Inverse folding.
């Protein structure tokens, strides 16, 4: 068996913890967006039609 | 902003234009009116638009005769019937416009 | 966002990844096709442009879906894309 | 408040946040669409203004 921990080299973790870690990452990452928002904008004017045609 | 064509009849103005995006055409359309339009009448000017016989820009839907119910309103002076159409024209390798071509018809006051 | 804007989502169609649309990213475009009122489609657009994901809406169009034009109704087709890796 | 005022709520439509409507706040507008009597809509308004 292996004991409370195992023996001292530690043993053998060069297989366990080398075919592990992992690769962790770990991915402290890919969460939720606020996204972002565009702006609205460019108008105003003058005198023209719809003068004459109304 | 600039627009394309303007054609009136002393009761309504059928206009033809273009705007920068879903925004400036929204600013422009808000500045007028918004309406639930219902029984439309078909008339020989529509077909003259289908005929190309009255010069305009046939990206446009047709028409200019109907009956209008107000949805929203900003100018007390203008009864826009609806944003009759809107299509974002991209262009090509020879050049842009990228913007939103559109068409509106609106009866003013009085 | 379509449903809470009141629009009928008549068709959502994914795209092809743009193999020559970037050296470091394949863009997948999604063409969405929703019908309703002008206020509601402006709404749908602004909500997708306020989302927390990478749905960059670009080329927009819409028109009146009723042949005879007896009631107000606007079919709308918006193009919006996200950018996967290569 | 719409229901107790007797109004049919034909549509409630949220808005977009106003990204340039404030440095310290995003305003979300909500457009509400209710039908009934003048007394009842005055009522609905005054109740929302007393919330």
């Amino acid at each position: 068996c292996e004991e409370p921990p195992a023996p001292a080299p530690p043993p053998a973790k060069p297989k366990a913890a080398a075919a592990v870690p992992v690769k962790a990452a770990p991915t402290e990452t890919g969460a939720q967006a606020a996204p972002s928002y565009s702006y609205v904008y460019n108008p105003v004017g003058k005198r023209d039609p719809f003068r004459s045609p109304i | 902003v600039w627009v394309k064509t303007f054609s009136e009849n002393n009761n309504a103005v059928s206009i033809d234009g273009s705007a920068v995006s879903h925004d400036e055409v929204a600013e422009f359309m808000r500045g007028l009116n918004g309406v639930v339009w219902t029984p439309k009448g078909m008339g020989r000017l529509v077909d003259r638009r289908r005929d190309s016989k009255t010069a305009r820009v046939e990206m446009l839907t047709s028409d200019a005769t109907i009956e209008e119910f107000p949805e929203a309103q900003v100018s007390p002076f203008f009864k826009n019937i609806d944003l009759q159409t809107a299509k974002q024209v991209g262009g090509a390798q020879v050049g842009v416009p990228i913007l939103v071509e559109f068409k509106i018809t609106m009866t003013s006051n009085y | 966002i379509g449903k809470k804007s009141g629009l009928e989502l008549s068709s959502v169609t994914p795209g092809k990844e743009s193999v020559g649309g970037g050296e470091f990213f394949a863009r997948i475009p999604i063409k969405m096709t929703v019908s309703g009122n002008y206020h509601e489609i402006a709404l749908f657009l602004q909500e997708m442009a306020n989302m927390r994901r990478i749905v960059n809406v670009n080329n927009i169009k819409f028109d009146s879906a009723k042949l005879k034009n007896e009631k107000v109704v606007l079919q709308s087709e918006f193009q919006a894309t996200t950018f996967r890796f290569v």
Remarks:
- The radius of gyration of chain A is 34 Å.
